[PDB]
Design a protein around this ligand. Structure first.
Ligand code: MG
Ligand code: MG
Ligand code: MG
Ligand code: MG
Lengths: 531, 106, 280, 112, 56
């Protein structure tokens, strides 16, 4: 029938699209039929995003092949975006940090918590796209009034909307991700980045408390994004960011790919981190610091409070609590903030020390090394075990260790935070592992970095390219990273972007550069006007 | 109103006459005098300069911006503080009853 | 119980006075009325208006308060949001924006009513009913649309447009199912309580005694996203025959078999990196 | 000169209290300051900030008040308004929406 | 619903748009005093509903 024919025709076209070289190496967890059945019958076309995504991707592939790169920043106004393109920068970054800082008519400006409505970054991007298209219309109008010689003499700028924009963690589950991608596509944006953090856990000015999600959850965000892009017939550029380099925590132990990085206690008579923390807070409260009532969030049993108390007593922490309350009283019972922070720091150090935190791989390695030192016959070499453990689920690692007669005490439950998050060994190896898992679901991979360091970048790039040699990468440059205290020469700073490009980082960006230059400009002009 | 597009240098005014122009307005009872789209203009110049510097001198462009901020003690040198990191951290402490984990092990 | 002090509230407020008078006064009178009804073992029976006119009509017919839900907000859509099922996948501004229309309609109805009543005689006023257009609204805050800063943002947006009441439920956001008997996912009680506490913190900052409604979905829930809270632990289900391979590994092995037998569309096992020994 | 009475104002207000405290208090103090400057034959010299950061920075540098114009609002556009020349052809909500961002930035800077 | 019942086309007027208001616009009489975005914004909701009904 016409109905069946129309459907089969779009399915065939969609399959050809799936199978095109654009998506070589990409795994979709759905079929062409599943895409077509979402599209209805009334034609739509997101031509700006569709055409920009095509040309932008081709350009990035060109640069990757030549081991060259785009070095850009986040414009803070439509004028900044148009100016960048006039100056010859080929593409534009748009980040959540600056979006948070800017606010809106209904959103108070603030820190980078991605706590704005999920429409916020798309709405900001829409302004930039309109500015670029408008600049193109205005430029063309003037060029049409020129002679052929005038046109040859006068540069024509490229105002195509080559934008990669921040989708944070996707702002929820699959319908949130799809909504966010839809909103970006509708306003003409061809590229989007999604990171493997848990939403609603971002910390300001702390060295801890950065929380990842399991790789299955991250991959499903990437896959949901691809599904929405496919429905909309836009070959949008999916950028998968990992925060594992400096992450401390993960909200689940369920994914096999995260399990090698879980930290567990090896001394199993130590009461849980959580119970010890709550017992410490409760003691402050019972000694008369009524403001420390956080333990009332939980319903911990008497036996658990007692066992934790025993540990805190033995380790001298209850001594520190007594001292702290006395100091608080001596200082006139003002805010306990700073005093509490100091005791908490000592508590964390003491718990870590006594618990004997390590990965399961490390725990088994210790046993095998001991056997070797004792002159017992080797079941496998240390390096062989480490290679096995690195790619083993906890289940598989335990089973193998049991075969080797190595069954060390190890418990990652004991080390969980009060919220119930697991502790993990953050670092470049973990960033590599998360990124390798994401690679078949993303067009560009990005390891979030605080410090600008070529050696760190190289470790990541070489590890990715050993498995996925055609995998394009992206590199962030923090505006707050102090370049002058690195001791780098002026020339090293000049060459840093080119060095990134040589390693296959094709799109490198100073996230909220626009925000910074906006501030400096205003300070300077206001000062000059007054003076 | 003071138009941003009015060419000050072709007035023939001395630098000092330009310096004194706002005070002269005030003397006549003009209490609120304004360069209408000044912000738009300085935004443009800033972006042109930074984009040019980034293309020409790579990350030295950012280093130089950072140096200027240190020189004038701008609050932009600590951007996380500028946009309200400390007050937000305090809000997390209140919201979580100080149970939210901010300290690392490892 | 507040998990914070008066000092912690005050240090958020700055020095420039603000006042959310509509939400503040509505919340005060609304709460007092509910307490009155509770004492008398009486109740308000209402529905969710789908338009400003419906909200005004409800009050003219004598209904004392208004409900506003995410289901209808999802169904309605907006200039940028496609209408759809109740997934709370709209931006967190969506229900506050819808509530804002209702509050404006109610305040406008009050202004128009008062204008006409001013033209009446004393006897005419005594004879002609004056309707109560005070914005007694309890509105849907879903699961809070994230963590504490999301909850605080959502509550702020409701308060700013005059809403005095908000409900928060103990589901995990982004897991809502359509037409299934399973897959309803709770969060641990500590996470839920922190949403309620964050909401109270924001209301306190804003000096609005807003009405916090705590919803539980545990009556028909199947799953929870964490085992960490002591209060959930009595309800956890576990295996007692420990040589049975994990539910997860069995599920993935089943899917992989379909795939290997030629049902190429069932490739969901490729989401995971399950080892050979576990597959076996 | 008002071309209306107090009664004509009151009959528009209804019965449910509202208060625009930020505008009300700012207008009071701002007007007093301008009167003070006028008496002293002094003035505020300012410019139109193009971002919330510019507005906050202006105040930090000691400029006492802020201008916001339609020219820049036209140039900036919005998610639904193409940028362009100063024709005041944007919806009438456009300049208030831009001002709202500046007010929020200023109040937030005060809180921080 | 109109299209489901067989009505072939839809009208959208300023009177009803004025009566409805928005998050920032007080409802009121038909003065066309809303911002000029007001009727397009209302129409956008209808178009999305129609396209969505077609997809479903
Ligand atoms: Mg890839
Ligand atoms: Mg809901
Ligand atoms: Mg104008
Ligand atoms: Mg009309």
């Amino acid at each position: 029938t016409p109905f069946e024919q129309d459907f089969e025709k779009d399915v065939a076209a969609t399959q050809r699209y799936f199978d095109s070289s654009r998506f070589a190496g990409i795994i979709r967890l759905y079929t062409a039929r599943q895409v077509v059945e979402q599209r209805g019958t009334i034609p739509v076309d997101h031509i700006v995003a569709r055409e920009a995504a095509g040309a932008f991707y081709e350009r990035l592939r060109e640069l990757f092949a030549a081991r060259k790169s785009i070095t850009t920043f986040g414009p803070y106004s439509p004028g900044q975006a148009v100016s960048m393109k006039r100056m010859g920068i080929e593409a534009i970054y748009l980040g959540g940090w600056a979006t948070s800082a800017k606010g809106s008519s209904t959103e108070d400006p603030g820190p980078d918590l991605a706590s704005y409505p999920l429409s916020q970054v798309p709405d900001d991007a829409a302004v930039l796209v309109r500015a670029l298209l408008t600049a193109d219309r205005n430029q063309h109008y003037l060029r049409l009034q020129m002679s052929e010689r005038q046109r040859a003499a006068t540069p024509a700028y490229d105002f195509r909307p080559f934008i990669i924009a921040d989708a944070d963690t996707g702002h929820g589950g699959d319908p949130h991700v799809r909504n966010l991608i839809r909103r970006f596509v509708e306003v003409g944006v061809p590229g989007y980045h999604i990171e493997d953090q848990r939403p609603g856990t971002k910390k300001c000015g702390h060295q801890g408390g950065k929380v990842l999600v399991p790789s299955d959850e991250q991959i499903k965000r990437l896959n949901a994004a691809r599904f929405q892009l496919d429905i909309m017939r836009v070959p949008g550029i999916i950028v998968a960011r990992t925060d594992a380099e400096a992450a401390n925590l993960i909200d689940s132990r369920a994914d096999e790919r995260d399990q090698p990085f879980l930290l567990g206690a090896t001394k199993l008579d130590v009461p849980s981190y959580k119970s010890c923390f709550l017992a410490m807070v409760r003691r402050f409260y019972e000694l008369g610091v009524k403001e420390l009532n956080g333990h009332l969030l939980y319903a911990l049993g008497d036996s658990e409070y007692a066992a934790a108390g025993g540990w805190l007593e033995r380790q001298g922490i209850f001594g520190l609590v007594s001292d702290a309350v006395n100091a608080w009283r001596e200082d006139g019972q003002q805010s306990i903030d700073g005093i509490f922070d100091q005791v908490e720091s000592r508590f964390v150090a003491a718990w870590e020390d006594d618990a004997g935190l390590m990965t399961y791989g490390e725990a088994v390695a210790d046993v095998l090394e001991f056997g070797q030192s004792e002159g017992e016959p080797i079941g496998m070499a240390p390096e062989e075990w480490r290679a096995f453990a690195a790619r083993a689920s906890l289940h598989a690692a335990r089973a193998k260790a049991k075969e080797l007669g190595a069954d060390p005490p190890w418990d990652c439950e004991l080390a969980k935070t009060p919220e119930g998050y697991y502790q993990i060994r953050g670092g470049i190896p973990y960033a590599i592992a998360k990124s390798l898992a994401a690679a078949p679901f993303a067009d560009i991979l990005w390891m979030e970095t605080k410090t600008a360091d070529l050696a760190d970048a190289r470790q990541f790039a070489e590890a990715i390219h050993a498995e996925f040699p055609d995998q394009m990468l992206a590199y962030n440059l923090s505006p707050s990273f102090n370049w002058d205290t690195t001791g780098m020469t002026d020339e090293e700073m000049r060459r840093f972007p080119e060095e990134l490009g040589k390693m296959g980082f094709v799109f490198n960006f100073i996230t909220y550069g626009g925000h910074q230059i906006d501030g400096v400009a205003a300070e300077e002009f206001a000062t000059a006007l007054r003076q | 109103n003071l138009s941003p597009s009015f060419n000050w240098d072709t007035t023939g005014m001395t630098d000092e006459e330009m310096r004194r122009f706002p005070e002269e307005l005030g003397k006549m009872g003009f209490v609120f005098n304004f360069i209408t789209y000044g912000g738009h203009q300085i935004d443009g110049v800033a972006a042109e300069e930074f984009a040019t510097a980034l293309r020409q001198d790579g990350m030295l462009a950012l280093a130089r911006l950072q140096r200027k901020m240190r020189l004038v003690e701008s609050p932009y040198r600590t951007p996380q503080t500028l946009v309200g990191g400390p007050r937000s951290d305090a809000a997390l402490a209140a919201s979580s009853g100080r149970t939210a984990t901010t300290k690392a092990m490892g």
